[PDB]
């Protein structure tokens with residue numbers, strides 16, 4: 265989603281990543297996301313809209329180009345969170361990978377469940393829903409990803425700014441959509457950018 269170097273990442277992929285993150289964040293904000301732990305995820309009071317960020321994409325690229333399925337050292341993406349994903353199909357279209365990745369990360373909520381208490385405890389950390397929680401992390405507003413065609417996998421990395429998943433903190437403030445943001449995108453339930 266725009267103005268980024270021609271570094272091998274497709275603008276269609278950027279577009280899918282941003283669109284999937286926001287639309288998925290919206291659906292959670294609106295109380296329309298199925299929750300594995302029963303019922304749905306609580307509405308969000310001020311779920312922010314994400315923008316694409318090329319600088320963030322760049323550090324995501326640094327992880328992806330290494331073609332090793334591993335979270336980068338927090339050191340190699342200061343201030344930034346990270347989600348990773350692989351498909352066995354190395355040459356699969358990048359935007360298609362973007363889509364599969366986002367679905368698979370978000371899918372943690374319906375598959376593993378989270379609950380009504382959005383505080384990131386040691387407990388909730390254990391359920392292993394950390395890719396979902398980073399996707400809908402309230403204060404995370406910058407998205408940057410890279411999809412690399414490795415020898416033995418199609419390797420997808422997204423990094424997130426500011427980093428989400430701070431232990432002891434809430435994923436998002438609960439409440440009616442738009443209810444705590446200056447300007448709301450009323451149809452989507454996210455604070456406007």
Ligand code: NI
Pocket residue numbers: 335347348394395
């Ligand atoms: Ni992880």
